A and B are shown apart, each in its own frame.
Chain A
């Protein structure tokens, strides 16, 4: 036999509209349409009727725009932060194929789409033909990006750290907030060096924190290891840093999204001595998706 009916969604601007990509599990890359907070979603629900002769008895057809946050792949732990409905058909029949117009006016999309370890945030259109025992359901995924402008305050990070009477350094990164294709311009200045340093590197670390209160799970992933020194410095030596963030394709910093999860980035500076002992200093940086002019 097969299926009696097949649901297909086609957006009104399905030719001109820009798409975007998403890294899922095992290195797979999906491509869905791109949307922005405030935009209207509109199109056609097209029902292909497959079994000619037969009839489809339903108790109503609808389409939903859905934005939600899924935790630990646990269906019971899904949380919808946006839900809009358009009833397309009353209870009735379908003998042949038919389409239905829909439009969701100026749709609020407060958060950016994200697929992590213990968290997913996704938007989609869900068409539902309601039947007596089992609904025909079709999901249709969308990407939402949250944009921002150049920040009001952006101070350089500058810090004197060390181990007492062994190593003193002063590191400086040129900003606190870097856009996704920005550049870490910085320097490491050595004030006291009484250990034997083999090499030094800057690392980019992405923490994904899930849960509420004492319920807290942090998933850490070391996105970049970037060597910046090779060999022993002496005091008074300055080492330059120029690390292009474009190379590693990170997400924006996302802080307490719906009071459910965070995603934060850190600059972990690490020096390594001759006996492989490892001295470090972590510093949070905010990432943000820059709005291109237009």
Chain B
């Protein structure tokens, strides 16, 4: 039908009109009685996630006019007594908590002394809502209301305020852990034949859980050692133990996006040991490649520190990728090679000088192809697609193409192609050696050019 949504938004606009009407007359308890009625509409199970989201956005807009009314009313000396207590008299828990959270942030602003206790209270009393959809949106409303008022390090020096960065990190890590619990629980609610509908429904809601991680990175007082010890340890504990491929894949990629590259360099072996634990249905390849691509962009960014010499990227990634692949039960051969591509790409952008590294990936790729008792690989196969893209990166990216001919293990990978791809690839390299002019070729590299011609004609 989809009427339900409009009928609800209709009713919301009715009650929010009578709400502001009372806020003009200064009839606060009459205003809150309509605000409660409005909030009533969020109790529904009948809406889907997209519909509910729309209704939430409507009701969140109206709640802001109330919130700002109270904030100013309190700021002008005329502070309502027992207002925190009074909104809790509400019979239904959903109106009660949205009002409690609204009234909470007004109290934190207006009474800095009670900040720690109120924040700690608001996250705790949300345990009331165990229903995945409604609870997620409540716990999101908690997060967005509190955005500007959470403790930090760049704060006004008012020595009557309470709570520090430690309390901010507990506050969000707790809200995170509860929201991820609700969002994973959504997997098992409802009838068993709507599995594809649920995973679609969960996917739409993934941003709500992810917002917790985003909020943690917006904390100025989250330095690297706090990230190491508290924040990432916190996040990873939920990620490995949720045992849910959808959540694991989202949250790991969400980590990479949200936190800075400085933090990633100090947490690579922790992060990649977590990758090796993830549920088999998780695309681990995508997580690792996403990380490598972000550290590649970090290398080429000037007016920035670059990659310290103690952080041996290549040795870390080569060794972990091989361990992560070892952890998979049936990773495609094309995917294993998609990783060898990014290992090269990492070594190219992080250590252009060190050609020995580029050859070690290629040497390792040979060992991989050799280890796999491989039947002849067609050009139509995905493995061949990747091995082509792998070999094309040194050729496309280096300044002097002579330097590619100096690689010892570049050519031995041509063995495993099709007859069609040898002819195509041999041509492609030799083509580039003419398109940019040739200098006199050294002894090892004279040998290379004839080896390329031999595969082209035969």
Please give, as numbers and ranges, the residues of chain A lying within 8 Å of B129 by CB-CB distance.
Answer: 229-231
A237 to B132, CA, bound (A): 14
Chain A: which residue is nearest B125 at the CB level? Answer: A240
A247 to B128, CA, bound (A): 20
Please give, as numbers and ranges, the residues of chain B lying within 8 Å of A230 by CB-CB distance.
Answer: 43, 93-94, 128-131, 134-135
A200 to B149, CA, bound (A): 32
- Which of these, B89, B134, B185, B189, contacts A244 with CB under 8 Å? B89
Interface residues of A in 227-273 (CB under 8 A from B): 227-234, 237-240, 242, 244, 246-247
A242 to B128, CA, bound (A): 11
B124 within 8 A of A: yes
| A231 touching B130, Cβ below 8 Å | yes
Please give, as numbers and ranges, the residues of chain B lying within 8 Å of A242 by CB-CB distance.
Answer: 88, 125
A226 within 8 A of B: yes
A55 within 8 A of B: no
Q: Mark A175-192, 1 if CB is under 8 A from B, else 0.
A: 000000000000000000
B439 within 8 A of A: no
A233 to B181, CA, bound (A): 11
| A232 touching B130, Cβ below 8 Å | yes
Please give, as numbers and ranges, the residues of chain A lying within 8 Å of B7 by CB-CB distance.
Answer: none
B241 within 8 A of A: no
- Which of these, B93, B127, B132, B134, contacts A227 with CB under 8 Å? B93
Please give, as numbers and ranges, the residues of chain B lying within 8 Å of A233 by CB-CB distance.
Answer: 130
Q: Which of A227, A231, A240 gathers most chain B CB within 10 Å? A: A231
Please give, as numbers and ranges, the residues of chain B lying within 8 Å of A194 by CB-CB distance.
Answer: none
Interface residues of A in 201-231 (CB under 8 A from B): 225-231
Please give, as numbers and ranges, the residues of chain B lying within 8 Å of A234 by CB-CB distance.
Answer: 185
Please give, as numbers and ranges, the residues of chain A lying within 8 Å of B134 by CB-CB distance.
Answer: 230-231
Interface residues of B in 411-437 (CB under 8 A from A): none
Please give, as numbers and ranges, the residues of chain B lying within 8 Å of A246 by CB-CB distance.
Answer: 85
Q: How many residues of B contact A (CB 8 A)?
A: 21
| A231 touching B91, Cβ below 8 Å | no
B92 within 8 A of A: yes
A244 to B85, CA, bound (A): 8
| A239 touching B127, Cβ below 8 Å | yes
Given contacts A237-B130, A244-B85, contact A229 B124 (CB under 8 A): no
Please give, as numbers and ranges, the residues of chain A lying within 8 Å of B96 by CB-CB distance.
Answer: 227
Please give, as numbers and ranges, the residues of chain B lying within 8 Å of A232 by CB-CB distance.
Answer: 130-131, 189
Chain B: which residue is nearest A239 at the CB level? Answer: B127
- Give the distance to chain A from B32, nearest Cβ to Cβ, in Å: 13
Given contacts A231-B134, A244-B85, contact A226 B128 (CB under 8 A): no
Q: Which of B43, B124, B131, B189 gathers most chain A CB within 10 Å? A: B131
A176 to B128, CA, bound (A): 23
A227 to B132, CA, bound (A): 17
Interface residues of B in 31-79 (CB under 8 A from A): 43
Please give, as numbers and ranges, the residues of chain B lying within 8 Å of A237 by CB-CB distance.
Answer: 127, 130
- Give the distance to chain B from A196, nearest Cβ to Cβ, in Å: 10
| B132 touching A226, Cβ below 8 Å | no
A230 to B135, CA, bound (A): 9
- Give the distance to chain A from B322, nearest Cβ to Cβ, in Å: 38
Given contacts A225-B91, A226-B91, contact A240 B124 (CB under 8 A): yes
Chain B: which residue is nearest A241 at the CB level? Answer: B128
| A229 touching B89, Cβ below 8 Å | no
A239 to B89, CA, bound (A): 17
A247 to B29, CA, bound (A): 13
Please give, as numbers and ranges, the residues of chain A lying within 8 Å of B88 by CB-CB distance.
Answer: 242, 244
| B91 touching A227, Cβ below 8 Å | yes
- Give the distance to chain A from B129, nearest Cβ to Cβ, in Å: 5
Please give, as numbers and ranges, the residues of chain A lying within 8 Å of B185 by CB-CB distance.
Answer: 234
- Give the distance to chain B from A222, nearest Cβ to Cβ, in Å: 12
A228 to B129, CA, bound (A): 8
Interface residues of B in 94-136 (CB under 8 A from A): 94, 96, 124-125, 127-132, 134-135
| A231 touching B89, Cβ below 8 Å | no
A226 to B135, CA, bound (A): 18
A239 to B91, CA, bound (A): 16
Please give, as numbers and ranges, the residues of chain A lying within 8 Å of B132 by CB-CB distance.
Answer: 231
A242 to B189, CA, bound (A): 28
Q: Mark B178-220, 1 if CB is under 8 A from A, else 0.
A: 0000000100010000000000000000000000000000000
| A238 touching B135, Cβ below 8 Å | no
| A239 touching B128, Cβ below 8 Å | yes
Interface residues of B in 117-161 (CB under 8 A from A): 124-125, 127-132, 134-135
Please give, as numbers and ranges, the residues of chain B lying within 8 Å of A229 by CB-CB distance.
Answer: 93, 128-130
Give 27 A-B contacts (CB < 8 Å), ordered by A residue. A225-B91, A226-B91, A227-B91, A227-B92, A227-B93, A228-B128, A229-B128, A229-B130, A230-B128, A230-B129, A230-B130, A230-B135, A231-B129, A231-B131, A232-B131, A232-B189, A234-B185, A237-B127, A237-B130, A238-B127, A239-B130, A240-B127, A242-B88, A242-B125, A244-B85, A244-B88, A244-B89
20 other A-B residue contacts (CB within 8 Å) besides A226-B91, A239-B130, A240-B127:
A227-B91, A227-B92, A228-B93, A229-B93, A229-B130, A230-B93, A230-B128, A230-B129, A230-B135, A231-B132, A231-B135, A232-B130, A234-B185, A237-B127, A238-B127, A239-B127, A240-B124, A242-B88, A244-B89, A247-B89
Using CB atoms and an 8 Å cutoff, list the residues of chain A in contact with chain B. 225-234, 237-240, 242, 244, 246-247
